[PDB]
């Protein structure tokens, strides 16, 4: 099927997806973007923790149900884009490849399959809080059982089942303190995920045999940046799959181009952030307000956070490579904190990135030329530094306007002009790269971000409400966390009820622990966390605050809905492939994983335009449906047609696609009238329009 739009599903039984196919057809999507489908750890909710590359997940219905879904989708005119996970597997006893290594050590065929630290005599596995061991059997074979975590026993160890300490001494692995370093490359700092050596061709072949055997339309590659040689992997993949699509999950910096021109693109955090930057207002006022809550230098914060992340999460991993490079740990740590991209892509015959490296350190550049392989190892940790320090710490501290605090965001950027957005789109004509606005990993859903950005349109009223609320509630949390909380409730508000109350508490504690200012995941400050949760309880029972909030929130909700509809219009009518996170056909207000993992629910889609659609909230589904179906009916027009910017006043953004489609959207909640040449049909309202057209609550998608 020809690719125009994707609908991302979190894990769902294949039979349940199959029975919803008519819905997806009606909505107008061309492709289902499925979560990983290979056998994972028991009851995995996400599928990123693979235990066997050879088997389709039985919990989801298994291989025959998968094939059935693929075939019935095809017959209904829908294709499949399949998420795959090459970088790592799960450390679990159902991972038979890994168990083979733990049982046989270096003599296992699979020792090279995983990225073990070869200088280590034994494979160190950080897990112990005590020495309380037992023996538990799996299919008649004895396992070392540490609180249900099972490890195999070699032939020598099996003579010592009644003497566990002696059994452990002769093992090829060593169980160590849970705070210690593992002797393998992980996914980021996740001890339970061990990295796979995709650079070895037999490992590529072995891990891709099953998943590539099915009649899907394309693939989405989890964490491409973890790979030793990502380009080579992508070339190997392209060679095996024929003409099927390849998309990568990869975070680009502003002005950074995807390194690999021979794949289809990324999952679209570039579009997410460029479009996000169109909806903010009043930088000066919002900056001034925040100066009085917390005045800090962003660059200093980022640099220091990166150094801290390296010391606390990756010290052994980086020390090892520093030793290989002949550069001291403190200098490599400093170099890593200097990088302004997720990673570089040096290979043994590609040194394009050497000036990026040199710019940060002359000595590091010199060490790279002398030890290319060692530096290529360093590259695999570069994204972990960036993600853990920036996405998972900095984004929870710098609270000027948290709609900007998103995966793929550079906090130096507060806004961009409509013209800068056009420059981005102009270069994208013909691309199949995704236009994303919400994902399973975004800090917020699109509709939350649109609400929070709407705050910046009325900053005087906002400042007034913030002060008023402070005086009503008398919070004993610090000013930055208070400002974070106010923005979060405004963005994510779903009624003063218990369900939402507990979601908000859960999220705020996560936000506090990520920021690591007053509390963290290792050492929980239960007292300070109680202050935050007590404040939220107080908010949901204090009558004055709720009345004040609901008056402000009624405004923000309306403003957010207008901005959201504009964003949807931009996503569908721009070059690129329109991506939808499950449920975002409707206004859906999601916070950070796990909040954004709540089950999708399906409703009947609206059948025609009615003025009441905006107020009852069904407008988003209608707009999504009509525009996706327009995209679909025009074949490849939205992919390949000319992109022609319009010159419009501030707060409006517009363009033509070819000579057929005129698009004008409001990024700000203000009154606008536009003059149009000749007659057009408004595809949302189904009205024939001419002359002066009002831009009210809806985007204008006008067809000639």
From TrEMBL:
Superkingdom of the organism of origin: Archaea
S-S bonds: 338-360, 418-653
EC number of this enzyme: 5.4.99.15
Record-linked CDD domains: AmyAc_MTSase
Domain Glycosyl hydrolase family 13 catalytic, chain residue ranges per copy: 14-388
Database matches in SUPFAM superfamilies: (Trans)glycosidases (SSF51445), Glycosyl hydrolase domain (SSF51011)
Biological process, per Gene Ontology: alpha-glucan catabolic process; trehalose biosynthetic process
Pfam families linked to this entry: Alpha-amylase, DUF1953
PANTHER family to which the protein is assigned, alphabetical: ALPHA-AMYLASE FAMILY MEMBER, MALTOOLIGOSYL TREHALOSE SYNTHASE-RELATED
Name this polypeptide is given: Maltooligosyltrehalose synthase
Taxonomic lineage: Archaea, Thermoproteota, Thermoprotei, Sulfolobales, Sulfolobaceae
The gene coding this protein: treY
């Amino acid at each position: 099927m020809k690719l125009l739009s994707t609908y991302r599903l979190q894990p769902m039984k294949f039979s349940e997806i199959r029975n919803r196919l008519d819905y997806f057809v009606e909505l107008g999507v061309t492709h289902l973007y499925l979560s990983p489908v290979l056998k994972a750890r028991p009851g995995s909710t996400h599928g990123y923790d693979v235990v066997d590359y050879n088997t389709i997940n039985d919990e989801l219905g298994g291989e025959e149900e998968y094939i059935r879904l693929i075939d019935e989708a095809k017959s209904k005119g829908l294709g499949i884009i399949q998420d795959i996970v090459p970088n790592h597997m799960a450390v679990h006893h159902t991972n038979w490849r890994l168990m083979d290594v733990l049982k046989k050590g270096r003599h296992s065929r699979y020792y090279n399959y995983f990225d073990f630290y070869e200088e280590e005599e034994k494979i160190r596995i950080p897990i112990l809080g005590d020495r309380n061991f037992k023996i538990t059997y799996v299919n008649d074979e004895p396992y070392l059982d540490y609180y249900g975590n099972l490890f195999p026993i070699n032939d020598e160890g099996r003579n010592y089942l009644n003497d566990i300490e002696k059994l452990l001494k002769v093992q090829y692995y060593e169980l160590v303190d849970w705070r210690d370093y593992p002797s393998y490359r992980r996914f980021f700092a996740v001890n339970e995920l061990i990295a796979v050596r995709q650079e070895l061709e037999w490992v590529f072949e072995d891990s891709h045999s099953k998943i590539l055997s099915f009649e899907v339309d394309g693939y989405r590659i989890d964490h491409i940046d973890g790979l030793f040689k990502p380009e080579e992997y992508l070339r190997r993949l392209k060679n095996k799959i024929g003409n099927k699509h390849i998309f990568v999950e990869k975070i680009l910096s502003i002005g950074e181009k995807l390194r690999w021109d021979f794949i289809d693109g990324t999952t679209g955090y570039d579009f997410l952030n460029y479009s996000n930057l169109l909806f903010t207002d009043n930088e000066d006022k919002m900056t001034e307000i925040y100066k009085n809550i917390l005045d800090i230098d962003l660059d200093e914060l980022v640099k220091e956070t990166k150094k801290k992340i390296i010391d606390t999460l990756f010290k052994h991993d980086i020390e090892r490579i520093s030793m290989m490079l002949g550069v001291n740990y403190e200098e490599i740590k400093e170099f890593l904190s200097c990088l302004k991209v997720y990673r570089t892509y040096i290979t043994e015959n590609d040194f394009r990135d050497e000036e990026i490296i040199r710019n940060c350190s002359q000595k590091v550049y010199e060490s790279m030329k002398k030890n290319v392989t060692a530096f290529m190892k360093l590259q695999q940790y570069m994204p972990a530094v960036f993600a853990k320090a920036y996405e998972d710490t900095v984004l929870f501290i710098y609270n000027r306007l948290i709609s900007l605090n998103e995966v793929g965001s550079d906090l130096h950027y507060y806004s961009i002009s409509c013209d800068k957005f056009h420059e981005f789109n102009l270069k994208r004509v013909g691309t199949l790269s995704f236009n994303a606005t919400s994902t399973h990993d975004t800090k917020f859903s699109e509709d939350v971000r649109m609400r929070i950005s709407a705050i910046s349109e009325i900053p005087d009223e906002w400042a007034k409400k913030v002060n008023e609320w402070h005086n009503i509630l008398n919070p004993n949390i610090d000013k930055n966390d208070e400002y974070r909380l106010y923005q979060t409730i405004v963005g994510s508000f779903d009624g003063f009820n218990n369900e939402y109350k507990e979601r908000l508490k859960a999220h705020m504690i996560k936000a506090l622990r990520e920021a690591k200012v007053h509390t963290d995941w290792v050492n929980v400050n239960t007292e300070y966390e109680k202050k935050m949760t007590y404040l939220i309880d107080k908010m949901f029972n204090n009558e004055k605050f709720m009345e004040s909030f609901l008056e402000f929130e009624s405004k923000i909700d309306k403003m957010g809905k207008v901005k959201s509809l504009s964003l949807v219009a931009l996503k569908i009518t721009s070059p690129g492939v329109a991506d939808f996170y499950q449920g975002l056909e409707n206004f859906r207000y999601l916070l950070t994983d796990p909040d954004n993992r709540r089950p999708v629910v399906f409703s009947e889609l609206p059948k025609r335009y009615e003025e009441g659609l905006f107020n009852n909230g069904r407008i988003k589904a209608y707009v999504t449906k009509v525009l996706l179906n327009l995209r679909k009916s025009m074949k490849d027009f939205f992919i390949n047609s000319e992109y022609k910017p319009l010159k419009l006043q501030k707060g409006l953004c517009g363009f033509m696609r070819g000579d057929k489609v005129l698009v004008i959207v409001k990024t700000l909640n203000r009154d606008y009238d536009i003059e149009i040449d000749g007659e057009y049909t408004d595809v949302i309202t189904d009205e024939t329009v001419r002359g002066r057209v009002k831009v009210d609550k809806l985007p204008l998608i006008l067809v000639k």
